[PDB]
């Protein structure tokens with residue numbers, strides 16, 4: 001009951017995060033950070049656990065998340081990596097804050113029974 005409902009909510013949230021209406025700020029989070037293409041030679045020294053929306057999508061499709069808290073932790077890990085690696089005034093950090101606001105506002109509405 002509660003768990004299947006929670007996972008439909010998580011799937012809905014991730015689908016919205018991929019939607020065209022949020023694409024102008026969500027697109028850097030769609031795929032794993034390409035360290036070689038972006039020349040981020042210190043990325044793996046700073047970030048021990050990379051995360052992105054396509055990875056979260058694959059984990060939802062594989063039924064890897066047992067509940068909403070685990071899904072939530074991966075979404076927040078993705079934003080935390082962005083805040084850790086990039087300076088706070090970077091354009092990508094402004095995009096992260098906007099996409100995190102979309103996520104947190106809907107994740108707050110998670111079914112609780």
Ligand SMILES: COc1cc2c(cc1-c1c(C)noc1C)[nH]c1nc(C)nc(-c3ccnc4ccccc34)c12
Pocket residue numbers: 028029033034038040081082085086091092
């Ligand atoms: C600066 O952070 C990123 C940039 C890009 C990214 C991921 C990250 C990233 C990091 C690091 N930590 O968390 C995220 C999210 N994926 C990309 N794909 C492409 C093709 N271009 C860019 C990009 C290149 C140059 N300036 C930009 C300015 C703003 C936004 C994107 C870019 C990026």
